[PDB]
Design a protein around this ligand. Sequence first.
Ligand SMILES: [Zn+2]
Ligand SMILES: [Zn+2]
Ligand SMILES: [Zn+2]
Ligand SMILES: [Zn+2]
Ligand SMILES: [Zn+2]
Ligand SMILES: [Zn+2]
Ligand SMILES: [Zn+2]
Ligand SMILES: [Zn+2]
Ligand SMILES: [Zn+2]
Ligand SMILES: [Zn+2]
Lengths: 188, 188, 189, 188, 181, 188, 181, 188, 189, 188
Amino acid sequence: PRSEEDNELNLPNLAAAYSSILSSLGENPQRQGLLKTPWRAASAMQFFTKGYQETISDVLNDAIFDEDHDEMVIVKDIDMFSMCEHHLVPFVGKVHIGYLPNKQVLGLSKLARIVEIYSRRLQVQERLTKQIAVAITEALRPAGVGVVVEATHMCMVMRGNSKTVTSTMLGVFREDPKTREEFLTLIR
Amino acid sequence: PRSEEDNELNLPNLAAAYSSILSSLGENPQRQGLLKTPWRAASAMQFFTKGYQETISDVLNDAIFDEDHDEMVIVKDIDMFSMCEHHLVPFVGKVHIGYLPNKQVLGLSKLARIVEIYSRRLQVQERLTKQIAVAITEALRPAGVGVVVEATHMCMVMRGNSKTVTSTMLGVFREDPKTREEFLTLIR
Amino acid sequence: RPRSEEDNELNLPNLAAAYSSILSSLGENPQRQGLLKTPWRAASAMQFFTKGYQETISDVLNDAIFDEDHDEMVIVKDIDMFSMCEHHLVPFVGKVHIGYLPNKQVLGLSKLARIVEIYSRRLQVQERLTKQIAVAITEALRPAGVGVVVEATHMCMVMRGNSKTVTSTMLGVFREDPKTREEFLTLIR
Amino acid sequence: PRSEEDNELNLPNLAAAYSSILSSLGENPQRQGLLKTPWRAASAMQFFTKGYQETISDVLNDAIFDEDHDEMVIVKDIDMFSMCEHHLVPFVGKVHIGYLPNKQVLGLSKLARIVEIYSRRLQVQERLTKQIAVAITEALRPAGVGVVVEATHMCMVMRGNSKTVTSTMLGVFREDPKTREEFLTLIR
Amino acid sequence: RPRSEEDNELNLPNLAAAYSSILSSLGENPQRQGLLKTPWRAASAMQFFTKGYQETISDVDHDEMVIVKDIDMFSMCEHHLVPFVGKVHIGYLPNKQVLGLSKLARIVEIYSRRLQVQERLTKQIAVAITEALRPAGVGVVVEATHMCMVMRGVSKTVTSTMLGVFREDPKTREEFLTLIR
Amino acid sequence: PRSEEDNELNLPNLAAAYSSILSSLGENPQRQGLLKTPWRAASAMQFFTKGYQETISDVLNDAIFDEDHDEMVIVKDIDMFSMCEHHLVPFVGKVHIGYLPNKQVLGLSKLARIVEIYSRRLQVQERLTKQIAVAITEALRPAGVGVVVEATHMCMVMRGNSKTVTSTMLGVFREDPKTREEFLTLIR
Amino acid sequence: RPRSEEDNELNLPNLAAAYSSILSSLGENPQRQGLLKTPWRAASAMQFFTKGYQETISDVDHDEMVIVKDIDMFSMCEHHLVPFVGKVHIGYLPNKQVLGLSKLARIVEIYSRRLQVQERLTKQIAVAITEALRPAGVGVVVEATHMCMVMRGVSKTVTSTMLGVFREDPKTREEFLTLIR
Amino acid sequence: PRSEEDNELNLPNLAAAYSSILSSLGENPQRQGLLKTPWRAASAMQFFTKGYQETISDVLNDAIFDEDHDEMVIVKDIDMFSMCEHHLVPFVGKVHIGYLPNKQVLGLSKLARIVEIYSRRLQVQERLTKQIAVAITEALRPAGVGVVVEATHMCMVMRGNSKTVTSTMLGVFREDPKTREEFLTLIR
Amino acid sequence: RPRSEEDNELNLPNLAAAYSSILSSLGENPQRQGLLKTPWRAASAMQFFTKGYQETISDVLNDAIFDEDHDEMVIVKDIDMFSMCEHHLVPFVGKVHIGYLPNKQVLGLSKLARIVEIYSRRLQVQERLTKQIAVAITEALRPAGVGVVVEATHMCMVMRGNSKTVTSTMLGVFREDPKTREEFLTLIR
Amino acid sequence: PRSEEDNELNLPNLAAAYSSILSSLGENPQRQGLLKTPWRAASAMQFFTKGYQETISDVLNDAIFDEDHDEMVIVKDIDMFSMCEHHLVPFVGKVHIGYLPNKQVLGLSKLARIVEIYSRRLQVQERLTKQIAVAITEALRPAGVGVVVEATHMCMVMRGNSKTVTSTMLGVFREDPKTREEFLTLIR
Ligand SMILES: [Zn+2]
Ligand SMILES: [Zn+2]
Ligand SMILES: [Zn+2]
Ligand SMILES: [Zn+2]
Ligand SMILES: [Zn+2]
Ligand SMILES: [Zn+2]
Ligand SMILES: [Zn+2]
Ligand SMILES: [Zn+2]
Ligand SMILES: [Zn+2]
Ligand SMILES: [Zn+2]
């Protein structure tokens, strides 16, 4: 994964590229709000991709056991902020996670941490959705997991708004349609 | 102003800077969705700053005369999409324009064209608001003009949403408070 | 003279002929199933959208009911309005909010709606339609004041990529007394 | 397809017909507001039918490939503006697209260009709905596609608002009712 | 004298006879199942809609503004005999005399259940409260949907009567109009 | 059907009956506000029952189109204004029509004319709902048709508000419950 | 036999006497201005809230599902004598017999204006409709806010009675529950 | 004030009166649902009037803070549940309190206890509003205080819904209209 | 044994002592005006937030009203719930939706609310609070089935940067019959 | 200010006190769910009061300069999460900031950092409101500043929701009532 040493070393390279963009756009990088912009844009881009620094394995250290709880757990409206890999323009929305545990439940804070690791990268919504559902499956080994991501893509909102919904259903969520209906009803 | 010849000439320079950013972020620019990204991001950035190509003077050729109309004209909820100059991150919202004419009214399409010229640039919301109000004042010479811009800045929404409202009041809109009250009530 | 049904009957084939020419000039086949009756359908639709030319404001004015001892503000809000943009021939639809302070003369609700219909069903500019409604009421009732607010969505710019246009005409006490104007704008919300 | 040479050549024909329409309606085409109307209404009509200039095959040449993703992708609330072919009066609304890919996904911007090519023509809502569904099927070869179009027809809004809903279901969207239920729930 | 139950009994066959004539004049068959009891049902409905004629208003340091908003109102248009329904918002500044909430609602019912003009219904309620309490001021706002124009293709008519301090002090009027929202 | 000759001949009869009603209610028909009421009420009642003048048979010509579409078409929120046949008091609301065509479609304006023909009469909501559904079935011969009418009855709103919903399901709408579920979901 | 106006006249002083005792037992002064007429006013209000006892239900190819939703309901909790207000949604599939809208509302009024349990009020209305029309099925849904627990710090209690085809056919029940939304 | 000893002693008296009410209404007090009702109603009525047990004077200690703030403090949407003194029927709603302090502030919990003391009694909304405003004035000696109570009276909602708004303005709230406007705007 | 008022009186100074230590460990001055009574105020607030320990589910169960001939679903939705996160000692507030199909035994509305209060006023995990409410109702009424849905906002993650947590326990016919479960989830909306 | 060395040193003290609180409340600190709670509640409390670690002077070193802009800037709906200093229970809401600059504007991210430094401390809403207003005044030296804070206090939400509104007006916001009216209208 990416490190703080890498970030320190690559910051002047990113600032050099951002200053070249300011020049190529027909702007004077030696003006009022454009003086510190090569560095500010570089630091913003490093923050938007800080998920590369994290590994899902080290975060996973919280699979708390449940006593006789064979019931569906849902965490809806988790704020998600990601970067489109095709155009390098943000896409912002919400993630709705649902699962049927098998003696192990994940902490609420840790569920939102999985969303953060994957969303803070150059992404495609379809991949971010599957990554979140696969991490949960591998962390808890549940009966099933359902992930629904609804986001507004700026790369087409700035072009002339429409929401993109992607859903990954695994285990009992994809096989039992009565379980899937319950999940989709409860996330409303 | 910027030209299509300039855009053709600077596109490979922008693509060279975007590919360097992909490399500096810890990504392989020779992969699936990252192959055409240096060019796609460069073309998106040229589109987001296409207002530099336009001049407010050539657009201004539509000051249609009015017969005995000394009444307030408002065009509210004009979609506005701009780029923050400090971080190079979008900021998206609406512009509400209002004016009291002096024998000359501007076409609705031309009012939204003023918003487009100024918004499609590296901006500060405060400047974009004043630029829109000054262009209208210089185009129509009215009794007064009021511009209210409400936008969501991604450079702070991606950091953890809050709307930023900036308002420029000129002429009778800044002097007569009864006129200003009417405008702010009608834009709701 | 206003437009008549005899004029409409006589000009319908001329409008259909022009619409058939438009279909061809746009690169369409006017002989295809869906376009066969279109020159006539578009012509009849355009005649309906401009039927306000057939009406006269003076002849609609016939019953100004004498509700004397009424020195209080009357408002008719959310009157549906459908008009045609005179610059591009594209619709613009919205609502008209009318308000007035009578001078021992009130106008019937149906007659206020007929004023909106006469002026809106024409090739218009929102600013003119607003003033025309306001002036018609002033001339019909001779009130203390009248306020007209028109909020409409112009398709000629919504089809180009979405913004309400608000125009307001204040006459008499509505124009002069700001406390009267504040009451009107609050009540139309 | 229609070209810019065709548009330049047919503009005076359209302006001549529009001038005739102003006269046939009982208007004075020499009055201030109507002077440039034959040309303005001609250029507006050319813009409303600019989809004739575009070809679907040339636009559909950029389909992204994603493996192990047999999950439903939805793009809802896509703004749509079309022309009624029976009366030449607009009909505006939203398009909701949904599909189950077969190792091939379409870019969000390209989905919006399919809606634009077909909607910017003299249409019937039923045809526009099928055209979009077919364009997606041809571009991706997916398991199934669903298109729902909700529009307000100015023909029966200017006559005294009622929404018209048309839906085209293809492949697994048509056959599996559990897939169709999920799509219709998610577009709400 | 106000209308009585003796008059309602005596005039019911007259109203039923007129409604029988209306069904025929409209091109309907008054002998069909759904129209058989209609001359009597319409007559009794019209008597109920105008039952306010039977009633008489004469029968029906804590000085702070009192407001009773969203009082349901159902009246009949006197020009076309078509209903108009809405809400009444009443406000007043007392002078050591307040009115019961049920009695304020009875004033609205007495005047609304008659052949009306919205402007008159608004003034009649404001005058009744002024005469009952002798307050510093009273404000009445009526917002109604007239079916005689909604059935013709079109939403709300607002009429307001301001008396006393409500009419004179604009700061009092602003407070009232803000609070009824 | 009723004619304009009949309306001219019966207007004084209706005015005579309305004048008698004013007297029977204890009003003075000579007062300013009631003088023209016998004629105004008579003309209003003739307008509310103008559907008697129209014939359903004279509406099918130059209305039925040919689609080649087996997909569901819905026209929701059609404003409906009718008169209660029991008390002669209005009942106003919305009609939602849906159908699965069989190589025959119906123009949107003609669907609205079916609602107007039947609603502008002395009605019972149950009958108005069935009459619309039968008219569409006879005009198009479709796979199925569904009609839902939701109206507020003034004859009980004036007595102390409550919406009445009546639904007629024919063909595949009546038999296939999965089709009926889709229709009822889409009209929301 | 049902309650009569003779019983309302005879029992009013008994109820007023009991309400006089309640004011004193609560620690109030029944002679203060606001409480003077309260023993009689509370007694008459309680008689009105239970006026359904006076009424008797026995007195009060177009076979498609008919629904009357959002019928206003105002009842009294029989456990604590505290009101509970809400809405009744009625639905039925007729068998060549339909009921007038006003008569459906009168069924709700007869049973709601009594000392009730929501579960019973729901079943009584469903049974009355079944006995009046003999339909294919009937569905009654009552959603009410109980003041006896809202005044204690807490929003809606939903009770549903499904009879005939509404109980048996789940596709019919789904349609009804969808349409009442 | 009323005590727990008084409540214990008067509970059988209230139960006796409630049993008499059940009989006077034509009910059988021996039926299952009514058996414990004389005691349940008695305990409910004692709870609804528990404000008699409290004293306003015993609430000011360990409650008044010292701020050095001359800015307006507002506590809106305080749930209020009271009993009509004319009919013994509840009236429920919200209290909105506002004040301009004079070097003396009041704890949020103690403001809510003032509302509870006065509301839990046989009341008239006008009195409850003034009693709260006077209690705050006497506790803090502020520049001004404003109390707005909006409640639904069941004694008229059960008769056929309508909100009653009462407002008491004291000090600068009564005198300065610009202060009163700010308060009424902020409580919305 | 459950917690008592004698226990609360005895442990209040111990809780106040611990809270005073927390103020110091956080870098605050416990002698400043606003913090003087805080060790006692926080201690009393924490005792109130955990007052459910003082209650017993068996003793609250005393009136299972015999509403026989009721083979229909009873729902009590939007019951306000306020609880304490056992992991971080931070509140989590929301609503509880309860539903059940009785077997000639119904529970009073007030008693259903008392079950929610007993379990919620403790150091909890939403999953446990949901199952505890469900099991208490099953044991009190022996019904055909019971459904409990709890939707709450956890401050321990809203204060960290905003998401509702929904937990549902389905027992008996609610768990087995999917048509019953669909009806319950539709009616709680 | 507080440091990371202080946090490391005081964590076992806080954990020891939290372990004592679990015992004093009648809980078994050895049960699964409570085992790591002394440390988790200690770290949560340290996060809720991390504003003590920050200094306002070090953050306020980046104020942008804009000339000829004497127009009002507003940042509304800034999420705020604070701790009640009387009971140590959270209070969450929104901050609405407004100001009239004097050739000096503050970055949107820096306005949000002022809210964070002061809100992440044991507070009283009245103080937090004044602190933010003062921090802006000191950083920009503007014509005037307005701060409105709306929060829900868990002290009186867990006890039986009412919002608390506090407003601090400085400079022209305090003196000119027409400026104050505009600000309060725009934050709605
Ligand atoms: Zn993109
Ligand atoms: Zn920025
Ligand atoms: Zn135009
Ligand atoms: Zn058409
Ligand atoms: Zn009328
Ligand atoms: Zn009727
Ligand atoms: Zn009760
Ligand atoms: Zn009362
Ligand atoms: Zn936690
Ligand atoms: Zn507190």
